[PDB]
Design a protein around this nucleic acid. Structure first.
Ligand SMILES: [Cl-]
Ligand SMILES: [Cl-]
Ligand SMILES: [Mg+2]
Ligand SMILES: [Mg+2]
Ligand SMILES: [Mg+2]
Ligand SMILES: [Mg+2]
Ligand SMILES: [Mg+2]
Ligand SMILES: [Mg+2]
Ligand SMILES: [Mg+2]
Ligand SMILES: [Mg+2]
Ligand SMILES: [Mg+2]
Ligand SMILES: [Mg+2]
Ligand SMILES: [Mg+2]
Ligand SMILES: [Mg+2]
Ligand SMILES: [Mg+2]
Ligand SMILES: [Mg+2]
Ligand code: NA
Ligand code: NA
Ligand code: NA
Ligand code: NA
Ligand code: NA
Ligand code: NA
Ligand code: NA
Ligand code: NA
Ligand code: NA
Ligand code: NA
Ligand code: NA
Ligand SMILES: [Sr+2]
Ligand SMILES: [Sr+2]
Ligand SMILES: [Sr+2]
Ligand SMILES: [Sr+2]
Ligand SMILES: [Sr+2]
Ligand SMILES: [Sr+2]
Ligand SMILES: [Sr+2]
Ligand SMILES: [Sr+2]
Ligand SMILES: [Sr+2]
Ligand SMILES: [Sr+2]
Ligand SMILES: [Sr+2]
Ligand SMILES: [Sr+2]
Ligand SMILES: [Sr+2]
Ligand SMILES: [Sr+2]
Ligand SMILES: [Sr+2]
Ligand SMILES: [Sr+2]
Ligand SMILES: [Sr+2]
Ligand SMILES: [Sr+2]
Ligand SMILES: [Sr+2]
Ligand SMILES: [Sr+2]
Ligand SMILES: [Sr+2]
Ligand SMILES: [Sr+2]
Ligand SMILES: [Sr+2]
Ligand SMILES: [Sr+2]
Ligand SMILES: [Sr+2]
Ligand SMILES: [Sr+2]
Ligand SMILES: [Sr+2]
Ligand SMILES: [Sr+2]
Lengths: 82, 81, 46, 143, 56
RNA sequence: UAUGCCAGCUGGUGGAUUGCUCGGCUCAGGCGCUGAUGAAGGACGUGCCAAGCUGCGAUAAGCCAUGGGGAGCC
RNA sequence: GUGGAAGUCUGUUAGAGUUGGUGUCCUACAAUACCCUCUCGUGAUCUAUGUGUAGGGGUGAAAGGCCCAUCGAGUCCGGCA
RNA sequence: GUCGGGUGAGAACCCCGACGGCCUAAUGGAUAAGGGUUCCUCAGCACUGCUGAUCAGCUGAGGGUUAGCCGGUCCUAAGUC
RNA sequence: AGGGAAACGUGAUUCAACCUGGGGCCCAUGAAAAGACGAGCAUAGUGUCCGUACCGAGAACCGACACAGGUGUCCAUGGCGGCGAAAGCCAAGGCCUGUCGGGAGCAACCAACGUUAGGGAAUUCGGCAAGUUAGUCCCGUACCUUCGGAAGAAGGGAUGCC
RNA sequence: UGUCCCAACGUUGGGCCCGGUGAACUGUACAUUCCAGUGCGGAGUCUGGAGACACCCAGGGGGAAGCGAAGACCCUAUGGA
């Protein structure tokens, strides 16, 4: 478990009316990488969902501090706002 | 010669009408009037018919909802057939 | 629309006919309703 | 579990739009077992099923604006969209004026201040559009 | 407005119906005449030799 | 030697071919009117379970009499 | 000043229509569609339902227009191989 | 649309909550014609569904439309027999 | 009586519905019949027959389709806005089914569209396309005219908030 | 005033790659062609040369006198209306 800062600028590669969706993807990919786990095994607490969609589908925050824990027999992570 | 009462219409909705409103339901001849249905019923089970409501069904038959007087008990009447 | 009593009888018959060929007929004839109709895809008379 | 049927019964039992009924996330199993309207009312009393509140538009911002305008503000050339006669119906305004002038003249007469003949002469002048308003009429009566 | 598809949407009038006499859906409920058996037009049954090949 | 060409083998697909015939086609002989005593035709019913066909008509795949027939039938 | 006329004006009110884009589509969403622009919108107005007029005949503020995707003579079957 | 969760052999699209959105003469409410059981319930996924499907206007089986006072029914219109 | 967890109001303005009057127009004159009233009251009995579900549409209708088409009525008084049944935003209510998704700063090319220095129609058959102007108030307004009009001619100025 | 000088950068949906679904047009045969010539005088196929290792992806459409319609124009028929 640790606190990480996820940059979401790569969401700008996606059409602007759908930045929120892409952000949620970048978050899952960032965590899976940095906590060495499969993306399928990363759980995003709704808090993170609300953070990214705060200003609607077309306005994601540039970064987001997220608190994630890693564990269990198969290796998985759980994340949430901070 | 066609008879008036064809057969009892037994379904959940019918049972409720019988248990909660002292009403009996029958499939009757589509040429029978509310009055002819009232008579036939009184003469077949010996009871007092108070009201009769009818409906020409999408099954091609006429359905009758016959309410009996408080003096009679539908549940018991129907229980002997 | 408004259906007369006779129209109603006819619609009723069409509905009834629109059923499966009983399972037991299958066995007895050792192996399909050709008059199967759909309310949307088909059109009844009148 | 599929609770769309229950959603419909709850909307009717709670007398609210279906989009406003809330089903407790932790009781899908119990709600799914609800078959009758009675089963639904039961779960309502338990609070497992509730009606979300409907909103009403705030009128606070409108009220402040209404006050400014009632005081005569926020109605300069730049805030008008309709034609003058559209902002104030002219025939309607004439009806207001002429009636006020005739009521005035009628009070002065019965009061004694004006003789039927003086009243007549003024009444016909008013009807001919001689006075801009009541005050204009009074100022005239005072010779 | 085209005579085709767009003009087909205006068609919700009932004309030909099940005929009391012959059973065909040809009893024109406005004219009260069956275009198939002649009911409403003639006591005799509607019939014509052109309904078949001349020598048959 | 990949992509692939030609012919064949095993297995498909397809339903030709051959064989079969509860259906047709044509000829011949016999026979030949029905209906207000409501025909012909149609509709809707009618079965333990019954959608189609056939039969039948609220006495609804049937009721009665006489003769035939026969240990099976529905 | 009053009054409130008008085959009167503006108007994507409803509703009716369609100048241009020779745009989009052109094995279409559609055998006549889509978008923007455009015109009419108290009257020779628009609109629903009922009803009448039938094929060398109707109906036509006339374009040989329209009479069920078909009209300088409908459609069906027959004449007919 | 997205994040969690429910059910299930199986879930991007079946259901719950949250967050995010769309529709305001309509994408909401009541209905005429027309359709004809498409309505409700249970059980299903070979068929039908622009992908999938545990879903459904699909498949199997049951159930559902109750009137002196709402229509019809009565009157007559153009007009028809 | 009912309904509501509860309170279970009172006044006002603007007033759809509905009621009742006044005016004007016609080389146009705006149905008929059944029925009702006229013609009281009590009590009692009778009131049969047919329709009744559901859709009513970017999937229940017609268009071969779960078709971007076509298809009548009433909801025309929900809030801000403004002249407004206009735009835009928001309730009540409905929906995420104008039903395939996943991925590449996601190239060429195409459909729709935004911004372009200086020149400003040189482009083109042709300003086609796009743009310019724009609401409201004040000043002011030519030729011509059938004296109605032309006319919002043109041109000029103003416009927020407190 | 990007119509033009003279084009540029950007936005949304496609296009491209992946999962699933999954048609049609068209097809005498052969077919890697190019330059000339020849031929019913407008040839991928004949003749002479030249060039040419096979397969695949994307592209804009030069050619197949490309695909789509037994030429509408013109003439002819002891044709039609
Ligand atoms: Cl009704
Ligand atoms: Cl008055
Ligand atoms: Mg958006
Ligand atoms: Mg009834
Ligand atoms: Mg059924
Ligand atoms: Mg289910
Ligand atoms: Mg005036
Ligand atoms: Mg008409
Ligand atoms: Mg659709
Ligand atoms: Mg420039
Ligand atoms: Mg030039
Ligand atoms: Mg232009
Ligand atoms: Mg060519
Ligand atoms: Mg030719
Ligand atoms: Mg010619
Ligand atoms: Mg000739
Ligand atoms: Na029965
Ligand atoms: Na149908
Ligand atoms: Na004979
Ligand atoms: Na049967
Ligand atoms: Na005057
Ligand atoms: Na146009
Ligand atoms: Na003719
Ligand atoms: Na308003
Ligand atoms: Na879907
Ligand atoms: Na440009
Ligand atoms: Na080419
Ligand atoms: Sr049934
Ligand atoms: Sr259809
Ligand atoms: Sr026209
Ligand atoms: Sr159209
Ligand atoms: Sr119509
Ligand atoms: Sr006749
Ligand atoms: Sr004959
Ligand atoms: Sr006008
Ligand atoms: Sr106008
Ligand atoms: Sr043009
Ligand atoms: Sr354009
Ligand atoms: Sr076209
Ligand atoms: Sr007006
Ligand atoms: Sr035509
Ligand atoms: Sr012929
Ligand atoms: Sr609607
Ligand atoms: Sr399966
Ligand atoms: Sr349903
Ligand atoms: Sr008033
Ligand atoms: Sr109803
Ligand atoms: Sr529509
Ligand atoms: Sr809402
Ligand atoms: Sr789907
Ligand atoms: Sr800029
Ligand atoms: Sr020029
Ligand atoms: Sr020039
Ligand atoms: Sr100006
Ligand atoms: Sr290409």
């Amino acid at each position: 478990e640790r606190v990480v800062t996820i940059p979401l600028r790569d969401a700008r590669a996606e059409p602007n009316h759908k930045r929120a969706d892409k952000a949620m993807i970048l978050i899952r990919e960032h965590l899976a990488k940095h906590f060495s786990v499969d993306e399928d095994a990363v759980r995003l607490d709704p808090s993170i969902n609300e953070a990214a969609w705060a200003r609607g589908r077309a306005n994601t925050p540039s970064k987001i501090r997220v608190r994630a824990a890693r564990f269990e027999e198969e290796g998985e992570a759980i994340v949430e706002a901070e | 010669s066609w008879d008036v009462i064809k057969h009892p219409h037994v379904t959940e909705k019918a049972m409720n009408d019988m248990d909660f409103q002292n009403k009996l339901q029958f499939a009757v001849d589509d040429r029978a009037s509310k009055g002819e249905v009232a008579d036939a019923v009184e003469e077949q089970y010996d009871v007092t018919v108070e009201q009769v409501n009818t409906q020409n069904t999408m099954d091609g038959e006429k359905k009758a909802v016959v309410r009996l007087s408080e003096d009679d008990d539908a549940q018991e009447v129907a229980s002997r057939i | 629309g408004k259906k007369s009593k006779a129209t109603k009888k006819r619609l009723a018959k069409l509905d009834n006919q629109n059923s499966r060929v009983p399972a037991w007929v299958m066995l007895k004839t050792d192996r399909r309703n050709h008059k199967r109709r759909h309310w949307r895809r088909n059109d009844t008379d009148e | 579990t599929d609770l769309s049927a229950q959603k419909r019964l709850a909307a009717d039992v709670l007398d609210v739009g279906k989009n406003r009924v809330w089903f407790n996330p932790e009781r899908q199993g119990d709600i799914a077992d609800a078959i009758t309207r009675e089963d639904v009312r039961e779960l309502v009393d338990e609070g497992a099923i509730q009606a979300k509140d409907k909103k009403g538009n705030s009128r606070g911002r409108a009220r402040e604006r209404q006050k400014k305008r009632a005081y005569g503000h926020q109605k300069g050339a730049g805030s008008r969209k309709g034609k003058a006669g559209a902002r104030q119906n002219s025939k309607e305004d004439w009806e207001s004026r002429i009636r006020a002038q005739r009521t005035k003249l009628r009070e002065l007469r019965d009061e004694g201040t004006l003789s039927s003949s003086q009243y007549r002469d003024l009444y016909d002048k008013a009807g001919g559009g001689e006075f801009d308003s009541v005050a204009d009429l009074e100022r005239y009566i005072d010779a | 407005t085209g005579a085709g598809t767009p003009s087909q949407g205006k068609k919700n009038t009932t004309t030909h119906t099940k005929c009391r006499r012959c059973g065909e859906k040809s009893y024109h409920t406005k004219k009260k005449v069956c275009s198939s058996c002649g009911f409403g037009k003639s006591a005799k049954r509607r019939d014509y030799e052109w309904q078949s090949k001349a020598g048959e």
